[PDB]
Amino acid sequence: ISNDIAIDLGTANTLIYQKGKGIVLNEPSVVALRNKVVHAVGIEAKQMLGRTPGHMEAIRPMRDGVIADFEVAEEMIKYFIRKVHNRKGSGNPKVIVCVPSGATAVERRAINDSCLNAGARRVGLIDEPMAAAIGAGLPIHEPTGSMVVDIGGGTTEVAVLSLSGIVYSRSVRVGGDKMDEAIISYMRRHHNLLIGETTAERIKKEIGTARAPGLSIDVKGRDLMQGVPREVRISEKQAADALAEPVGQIVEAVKVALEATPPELASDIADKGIMLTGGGALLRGLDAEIRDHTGLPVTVADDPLSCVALGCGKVLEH
Ligand SMILES: Nc1ncnc2c1ncn2[C@@H]1O[C@H](COP(=O)(O)OP(=O)(O)NP(=O)(O)O)[C@@H](O)[C@H]1O
Ligand SMILES: N=C(N)SCc1ccc(Cl)cc1
């Protein structure tokens, strides 16, 4: 049995693929500190967001394709590696870490050292868009242009790939987080109601959509003037309005990617289509929106949230 693992350190979720097993951990990238000291990591910690008492704090070491808090991140990483380490397993843990293309050497050097103090002896790195493409099952080894769009929590990465390499690759600070922000702003600018990020993220999943039809839900927030709990009903349409901008910035980046794609490679993409991954790819109607604005066929990968991890794992086994 092996202790070799691949890690996808996301702003929102962290996944770990273990050689021989598969994906063996899937927990939010949240750490809870009590007055500091590591109190809870992952699933527990996330449930505390916007609900912590005065002597506690719920943190996301990564926010927007970066590591805003390095020390808390190191603990998170260490905890997850610790949590999945198999004492009956071999040593010399080989560790592949997924990393964005907009990744500074500062962020890399830290990621690396963090694994070494966690028990890693060797540490390899792999590009997120590559890991995503592989996980989604694209023929990134063949002589054909394959375009992948990994919409995550803090960033979206659009990349064209072929011959085991990257033809084009760009990262934009837009994703789920900003999609949540947009909903929070909409509720504030149109219903004078303040809502939390948890409530926002739930609205996104329950009625969020890139395009209006309709369907509706009840939002539990607070009225700004009299500062007391109130709830307003919101519709699929209203939801689309809130999300128009962040959705638009995704579509744009997808176009910019194409304009920068040589004619031959661009055709291969129009044949099979564009592949969306990441949790942001689960936003209803997003694939359809991109499809319309680009004219190209769009397909949502299977288990979008796991593509990067599964792509990293495939490499770990070869
Ligand atoms: N059904 C859904 N509809 C809309 N958004 C969703 C849905 N499910 C998950 N998300 C969002 O997907 C985002 C995280 O997806 P994820 O692919 O895990 O990104 P990440 O890898 O964790 N972080 P990063 O890649 O660095 O941007 C979160 O913002 C979620 O809110
Ligand atoms: N998974 C992503 N592409 S965003 C978070 C991140 C992960 C690693 C490093 Cl070094 C920086 C930011």
Ligand SMILES: [Mg+2]
């Ligand atoms: Mg990601």
